[PDB]
Amino acid sequence: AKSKNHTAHNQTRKAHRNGIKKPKTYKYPSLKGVDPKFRRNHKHALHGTAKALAAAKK
């Protein structure tokens, strides 16, 4: 026997009953998908700034 094929009826009411949410930004997002050459050199740049600050502060 035949029945309903598709409908988006009630779908926005379900979606809104728990408040369609933004993706909750952070400082320092994941560096996923960044260019590997930059990422490799960023590692050494951060290592050097860690040395410089540690020597500066102690």
Partner 1 sequence: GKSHGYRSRTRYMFQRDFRKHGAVHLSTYLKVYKVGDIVDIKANGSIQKGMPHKFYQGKTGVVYNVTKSSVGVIINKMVGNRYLEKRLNLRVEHIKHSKCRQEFLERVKANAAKRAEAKAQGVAVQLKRQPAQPRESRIVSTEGNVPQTLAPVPYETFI
Note the residues at the interface with RNA (CB under 7 A): 2-13, 19, 21, 24, 26-32, 37-39, 41-43, 45-47, 49-50, 53, 56
Provide Rg for the chain, Cα atoms: 25
C-alpha–C-alpha distance, residues 18 and 20, integer Å? 6
Show the binding pattern over residues 1-20: x = contacts Mg ion (CB under 5 A), - = does not: --x-----------------
Rounded CA separation 20/25 (Å): 15
For residue 12, the SS3 value is helix
Among residues 2, 7, 26, 33, the one that binds partner 1 under rule CB under 8 A? 33
Give the residue with the Cβ less far from Mg ion, 10 or 25. Answer: 10
